[PDB]
Structure formats: C-alpha cells, structure tokens
Amino acid sequence: NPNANPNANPN
Amino acid sequence: DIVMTQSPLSLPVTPGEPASISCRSRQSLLYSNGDNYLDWYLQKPGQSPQLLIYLGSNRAPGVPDRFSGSGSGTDFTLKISRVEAEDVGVYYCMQTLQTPHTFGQGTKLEIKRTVAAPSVFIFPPSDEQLKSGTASVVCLLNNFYPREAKVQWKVDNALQSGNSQESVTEQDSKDSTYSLSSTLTLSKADYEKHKVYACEVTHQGLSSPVTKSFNRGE
Amino acid sequence: QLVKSGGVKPGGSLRLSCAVSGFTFTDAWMSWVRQAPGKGPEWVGRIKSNPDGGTTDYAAPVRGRFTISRDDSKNTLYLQMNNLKTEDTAVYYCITDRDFYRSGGSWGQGTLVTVVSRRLPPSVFPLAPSSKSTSGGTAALGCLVKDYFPEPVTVSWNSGALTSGVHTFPAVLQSSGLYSLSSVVTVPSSSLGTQTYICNVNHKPSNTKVDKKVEPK
C-alpha cells in the first residue's frame, strides 16, 4: 500500500 | 526510508566493452499494477541528470538501444551493450514507490581509453601578485590518461613538501582525458631566495619523468 | 519544458518558481529535487495533482521549513523556502513522472541556491602564455582566481565567445580556509599577437565581477 502514483506510466 | 545500494561504485570500462550496474533496494519496488518504480539516470560531467530507463525496463526516448534495464522487486540492472566515450558520468538509481523518494549512491563510469601522456605547462607568478607579497606558481598537466600522476615541485633541485595543492578535472565526455593543476604558493621573500622553479611529472605515458622549469625573472 | 526562476542567507526565505510547458500541468504530480555540490541528488518534496487531492509530502530535513504549492492557472510549481540553512545550498530541480517518461530528456538547467553568510571576493591574476606554456604550436593561458569565499566563482572567456579548450578546475580549500581555482585555455601560439583573451570572473555571493586581459610574455 505505498503512496506511489498509480498513473505514473505513460504507456 | 528505502535505502538504495548501487554496485560497483567505480566502473572502468574499455570502449566497446559491456558494462553492468546493479541497484538493490531494501523494499520491493513492485507496485500493485506490475510496474517496478525504479528509474535510471546518467549525469554527465557538468550537466543535469538525464533519464535513461523508467519504471524498471522502459527505455526513455532519445536513449540509444545500447542501454537496457532489467530486474524486478529488489534487484535491478542497467546494461550498456557497448560503452562509448559519451557514456562517461555518474549513474544513479532512483525509487519512486514510497516517499521519501531515494537515490542510489551513484556509479562513476570511467572510460579506459589509450594511454595519453600529459602536456605539461608552467606559469610563473604575475607581477601584480608579486607586488602584493605572494608568489603562486602553477603547473598544468593537460589532457592525459590515466588519472594517476605524480607531480613534484623542485626549487633549485630541492624537492618541496607542504606548499602545494592539486586539483583534477572530471573525465572529458569526448576525448576521455583528465587535466590537473598543481599550484605552489610562497611568500615573495621566500620566492626570491631561489632561482629555478620546476614541476616534475611522472606518468604511465612518459618513458621518463618530464621536468618543466623557469628561472625566476627570466 | 521547465524553467526554474527565483534563485539568500541563513534564517531567510526564498521562493522558487518552475513554470511548466509541454504537457497538461493540472494532471501532473510534481517533485522538487536538489543536488548539493559534490553529492548525489536528494528528494525534497512532492505535490500531487489537485484532482488527486493536491496533498504534499516532504523530506525530513525540510519538513516544517519548506512549503510546496501549485498554481494550475499559471502552470507553475512553487517551493517556498523558509528559515534557510547553509546545508540547503544546492541546485534545485522540478520534475514529474508520466509526462517526463513520455518525453524523455534531462531535469533541465535547474537553479542554484547559495545560502551566504561569510564573503570574500576573489583576487584574479593572469596565467600568461610564454615559451614555458607552449608546445606543438599551442599555447596555454589562463587566470588564477585566488582567495574567495564561499563557492562558487564562474569563469567565462571573452564574454562567453570562447569556450573551446577551456578547463576550469574544481576549487581547492587553502590552509586559510579560502578557496582558489584556475581557469585555463589552449589556443594557437600564432594567435597571441592578434587575438584578445579576457577571463570574466563572476562571484555572485559577493556580487563582484572582474575582467582581466591576459597578456603574453
């Protein structure tokens, strides 16, 4: 459950 | 925090040969959607970091196919199939899974070009400085490789100690050489008690040490 | 496309602005990163897109002193730095993820923030070309920039028109606690009588600029 950006990937 | 460990810290590589860099995390960087939140950067000398690989294995636009990223979870590898001179710099890993975002310690890639002897130049003190009571003498070793060099100061053939400082440049992105300065600093009173000022350079590219010298006030 | 602007003493404040172009800023999460001289990069903080809550996270060394915000009207990211410390000195960059991965490239130029409390402008002396700095038809010349504080000095040649063959060495720390460096350049020996060589030495921390023409022997 990290606070990473779930939409970081441009592809 | 997530500690990132890079191996090796220093990576000498001959042009055309392959290079591999490892970044290991204490926490898995695998996110719930299958992506690994790790980016690879190259910082060329004097420049801002350039993105090479994003999210584990995606080669960023503008990066030659020589670069590729592999791994998952806690262990990742940047691979350079064939190293070029332009590849010199410091490589960094960076995890963005969890704040604070953290970086590897960096890997300095060094291009093992062919041995190049330094060009040796010497500069007497300026009149302006001497009138102010100080004498700075500069010895310049220009565009040499490898970095290891011995620079000794001899005044009237007496080896000096305790009155000089050295500074070396980063490896050059195109010619892959180093330059080095050695600077001897004396009071004007001490300076004038001697005639011959010389820097002696020993280097793998020199069959015998080179001495460049001048006579005070010549 | 990023352009950092607005970059100063211990305890004081400074605001960095990063105006963004090239993608829809409103939907981008943004981070500030910095790199102190001689060290690797260090994450400073992040701000989510406002549609995702627009919340902030900060690195421990800056929590409570720095504030990150955004004006989506101006496509601009801000870093408000308060109660500055000397250890805050660094080059600061604004970065993003998805839009940056898509475009590729570097973090841009970044902006240098130098927190200044002690000052000494440099002495500038010529490193004159002579037979002792000539070899194979090329002459080395330069300028010695001695006794200044703090870093950095910037050295250009002929107001930036001369860049080829220039080596500006990393500064050394002298026994006095003051810095020193030399900038040198290699030119045709045949040029010393007709071309002019001026080193331009800028020490922004003391707001001093010095031009010195280097004359041959």
Numbering used by the authors:
A (entry chain P): 1 to 11
B (entry chain L): 1 to 27, 27A, 27B, 27C, 27D, 27E, 28 to 213
C (entry chain H): 3 to 9, 12 to 52, 52A, 52B, 52C, 53 to 82, 82A, 82B, ...
What does the paper say about this structure?
P. falciparum (Pf) sporozoites are coated with the circumsporozoite protein (CSP), which is necessary for the development and migration of sporozoites in infected mosquitoes and for traversal, adhesion, and invasion of hepatocytes in humans. In this study, we investigated the structure and binding specificity of a protective monoclonal antibody mAb397, which was later derived from the MAL071 trial of RTS,S/AS01 vaccine.
Six substitutions and one deletion (from 112SSASTKG118 to 112VSRRLP117) were introduced into the flexible elbow region of the Fab397 heavy chain to stabilize the Fab through a more ordered constant region and hence facilitate Fab crystallization and higher resolution structure determination as previously described. All complementarity-determining region (CDR) loops contribute to the binding groove with the heavy and light chains providing roughly an equal proportion of the total buried surface area (BSA; 592 Å2 on the Fab). Asn3 and Asn5 display extensive interactions, as indicated by their large BSAs (73 and 70 Å2, respectively). Both side chain and main chain of Asn3 engage in a hydrogen bonding network with LGln93, LThr94, and HArg50, whereas Asn5 hydrogen bonds with LTyr32 and HAsp95. The Asn5 conformation is further stabilized by a π–π interaction with HTrp33, which is the only CDR H1 residue that contributes to the BSA.
